[PDB]
Amino acid sequence: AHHHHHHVAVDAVSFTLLQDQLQSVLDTLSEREAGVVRLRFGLTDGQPRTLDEIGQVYGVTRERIRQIESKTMSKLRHPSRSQVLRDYLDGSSGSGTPEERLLRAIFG
Template identity: 35%
Template structure:
């Protein structure tokens, strides 16, 4: 069991680095895009919400929430691939 401790620590450090990287990229999104993703995926440490729940909170259609979410995820993907060495 002692041989697994370095692996656990390495995994924890890698996970923390990925979360910090994601946080930097989320800050590049518009306020609404960032808020929708945070609500959808329960970040940081909150409860996940459905597109319908978010639509009610914002007073918009569920399909519009879906479009905002899709656009934000696409932007995140582009920003994160551009950041990789």
């Protein structure tokens, strides 16, 4: 209902990444930017798409898709959107869950 998550390691570092918070990251992008990200990384159907396949979807060249992907990644890293991304990467905390509220009450 909200539980879908993935455990991922990058180097010695572990993340727990909640689908609901990924949706919040994507919601901050335009329709085309989020659509290019979903297609490129296979976020919906599991099949990461080539630049040519994405170009076909959006009626633009492979080079245009490369530019859209590049700009989108710059946007995702830019400090103006860094809070939404920090909260995504901090999914292991369980910040904001009902369970966190219950444990706070039990443990005082």
